[PDB]
């Protein structure tokens, strides 16, 4: 009666879904009772302090357990053969063979090998001792308590922001580009040049002697005079040893390209010139928008004035600004679209260009860090369309949006969905049809009859980037071209030595197994958008239900009438895509892992023979690489893989429990509970006990969510168990 303090319509609910919907729409601030728009923005703003204070408490937790239970000071000296340590184990359910099988890495008690790879990130930003890691933990624990107290104070009625403070899109975007992006990256080059550059050269720059160590031997004199190439005079050599001064070099902003020879990481010096360069650009781009000083650009005159003539884009972008500034789901949907793509861009650019020292030698770290930021990118990208579909219901105004590009989206909305449905159907026909054709040719003993289309359009790009394995001799494989000859002292010889090395992940050599799987990724990208863009466009109505906007975003159905309307809502159009999302990111991570297993084992032909047909995906990647995983515990004994063996069956269990909420639906279960209510109310001596919230079955929309969560958690825990234990089992 009291727990949904936000929804009194749930407080009058005598059933047990009062508990379930007190949890799930507690952060749906736009539908709480008595919520106003000034009250809306203040709870969102304090909650962002709540997310920030969790992140810094989380990161200070990583700094603490590494400093206390980890072997970072032992891993510094030998960063190849010593395995990293996440946090020690105290499980009193263990047995004695399960204590000694988890003692590894040279430690005392049982430990977990950290596959998150925060050692490689910390080792290259200057962390060398555990005493440097406790200080970072106590620092972020202070900073996390600052953001806890800030979210409390910015709710207090003296310090509550005005409503016009939030809608100032000029001043925020002027401060976050210049200060939060520019000055922060300017300060991070300050951490690189002062601390992280000379720490690799074997020179301790701590808080005690950073005001005594010059970063450069003639420091601040080229910056004030002009000869900025003096900062790139004697760089880290080709025989540098990371962490020592053996062949050290003295440059602070070098522009080499390619990799360090030992670590096979990016150079620290061009990472300093990188974050310096975009710091200059973000500060310069942070002086664009008209806030309070008479100069700058108004957002209300850039959108509306870019209307092309002859009716190409309707009324142009006219009137969008009041539908971006006032709407939050439009702002959230753009942000999840941007962050979700530059989360993949993090993942796509860290296996090929590993930025931290002795990464892409630790293989399980590389496997986890790619697969993590792909599913993190996968969930964020489908939420961009989810909160894009909430925009068309809760925030869209057709009278405000007469004829702009946003309404022309809803105007030709069937042309969008039918052309996505053609591309998704063409790809699924002709990618599966080629694999089945290849599988039959493997089954009939004749591999020569396969369809093996060479990836010409991507090998043309790799040869244009400088990969002379294919011999297109086009631009950078062409030695007499222009772009090869405009950069032989600038940035090319490091980059061209780094591609033509066959044993890094920088522009891997590709064959027809990679033709087929990128089209399968293209299938999975176009079909996941087909489900989601249909969920955005048909959120306001279809011919089956022309008033879908009157019910809201997340409703069960519209009854059995009109032929039956199971899964008609835009929520139910969003949730189907999460299956096709996890499929798609499952396809990008199967292909990433198995091309990297065959690269790191050395049998690079074992992929290209077997990736052309789907049995080789099964009997050479799933069957073959799960040999030591499932042997984590057996009646002979157990080893260090048993925690990943147990999770691998734990993941199959949550997955299949997800089908129970997906195949069985609600009304089989509500009748079953009605027998349990009877058998409770008629049982002697249990009639002493009676419930408060009446037991009812989980609602239709809830059964979607609970089943998708069991589907997705069991999906993630299964593959992460297979990813960590197949990599680290043989490595």
């Amino acid at each position: 009666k009291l727990f949904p303090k936000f929804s009194q319509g749930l407080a009058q609910d005598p059933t047990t879904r009062r508990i379930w919907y007190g949890l799930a729409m507690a952060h749906d601030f736009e539908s709480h009772d008595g919520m106003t728009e000034e009250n809306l923005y203040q709870k969102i703003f304090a909650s962002h302090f709540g997310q920030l204070s969790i992140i810094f408490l989380w990161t200070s937790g990583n700094l603490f357990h590494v400093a206390w239970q980890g072997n970072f000071e032992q891993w510094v000296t030998d960063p190849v053969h010593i395995r990293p340590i996440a946090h020690a184990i105290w499980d009193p359910h263990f047995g004695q063979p399960a204590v000694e099988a988890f003692t590894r890495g040279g430690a005392s008690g049982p430990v977990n090998i950290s596959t998150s790879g925060v050692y490689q990130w910390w080792y290259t930003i200057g962390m060398r001792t555990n005493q440097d890691l406790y200080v970072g933990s106590v620092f972020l624990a202070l900073v996390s308590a600052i953001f806890l107290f800030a979210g409390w104070l910015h709710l207090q009625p003296n310090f509550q922001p005005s409503l016009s403070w939030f809608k100032d899109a000029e001043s925020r975007l002027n401060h976050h580009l210049s200060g939060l992006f520019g000055v922060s990256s300017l300060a991070w080059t300050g951490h690189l040049v002062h601390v992280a550059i000379p720490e690799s050269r074997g020179q301790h720059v701590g808080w005690d002697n950073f005001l005594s160590v010059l970063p450069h031997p003639q420091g601040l004199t080229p910056f004030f005079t002009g000869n900025w190439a003096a900062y790139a005079q004697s760089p880290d050599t080709a025989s540098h040893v990371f962490g020592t001064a053996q062949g050290s070099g003295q440059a602070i902003l070098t522009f080499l390209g390619g990799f360090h020879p030992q670590t096979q990481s990016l150079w620290l010096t061009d990472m300093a010139h990188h974050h310096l360069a975009i710091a200059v650009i973000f500060i310069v781009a942070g002086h664009m928008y008209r806030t309070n000083f008479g100069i700058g650009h108004r957002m209300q005159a850039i959108l509306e004035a870019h209307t092309p003539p002859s009716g190409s884009l309707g009324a142009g972008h006219k009137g969008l600004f009041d539908t971006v500034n006032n709407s939050l789901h439009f702002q959230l949907g753009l942000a999840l679209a941007s962050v979700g793509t530059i989360t993949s861009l993090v993942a796509q650019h860290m296996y090929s260009l590993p930025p931290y020292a002795f990464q892409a030698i630790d293989f399980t770290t590389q496997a986890a860090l790619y697969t993590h930021h792909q599913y993190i990118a996968g969930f964020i990208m489908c939420g961009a369309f989810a909160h894009g579909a909430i925009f068309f219901i809760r925030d869209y105004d057709p009278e405000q949006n007469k004829g702009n590009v946003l309404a022309r989206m809803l105007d030709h909305k069937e042309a969008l969905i039918s052309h996505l449905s053609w591309v998704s159907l063409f790809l699924g026909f002709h990618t599966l049809g080629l694999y089945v054709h290849n599988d039959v040719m493997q089954a009939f003993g004749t591999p020569e009859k396969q369809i093996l289309i060479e990836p010409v359009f991507a090998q043309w790009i790799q040869a244009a980037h400088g990969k002379a394995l294919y011999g297109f001799d086009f631009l950078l494989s062409s030695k007499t071209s222009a772009a090869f000859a405009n950069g032989q002292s600038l940035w090319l010889p490091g980059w061209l030595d780094a591609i033509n090395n066959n044993q890094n992940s920088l522009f891997l050599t590709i064959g027809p197994g990679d033709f087929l799987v990128h089209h399968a990724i293209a299938l999975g990208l176009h079909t996941t958008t087909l489900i989601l863009v249909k969920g955005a466009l048909d959120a306001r109505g279809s011919k089956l239900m022309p008033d879908k906007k009157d019910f809201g975003y997340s409703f069960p159905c519209d009854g059995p009438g009109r032929g039956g309307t199971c899964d008609i809502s835009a929520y139910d159009a969003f949730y189907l895509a999460v299956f096709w999302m996890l499929n798609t990111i499952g396809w990008v991570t199967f292909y990433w892992h198995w091309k990297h297993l065959t690269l790191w084992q050395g049998n690079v032909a074992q992929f290209d023979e077997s990736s052309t047909y789907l049995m080789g995906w099964l009997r050479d990647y799933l069957w073959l690489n799960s040999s030591q995983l499932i042997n984590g515990y057996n009646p002979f004994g157990m080893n260090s893989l048993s925690v990943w063996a147990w999770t691998f069956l734990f993941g199959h269990l949550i997955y299949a429990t997800g089908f129970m909420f997906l195949i069985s639906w609600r009304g089989y279960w509500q009748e079953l509970i009605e027998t349990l209510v009877w058998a409770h109310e008629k049982t002697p001596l249990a009639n002493l006990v009676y419930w408060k919230d009446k037991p009812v079955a989980l609602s239709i929309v809830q059964a979607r969510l609970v089943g998708l969560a069991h589907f997705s958690v069991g999906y993630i825990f299964t593959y992460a168990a297979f990813l960590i234990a197949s990599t680290s089992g043989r490595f």
Partner: peptide, 26 residues
């Protein structure tokens, strides 16, 4: 317990300022 009692004696003055914050805001 040097840095334990010094942080605790710092937390005493920090809590006393928190008694100023717990009143001056409302």
């Amino acid at each position: 317990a040097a840095a334990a009692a010094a942080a605790a004696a710092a937390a005493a003055a920090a809590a006393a300022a928190a008694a100023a914050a717990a009143a001056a805001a409302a």
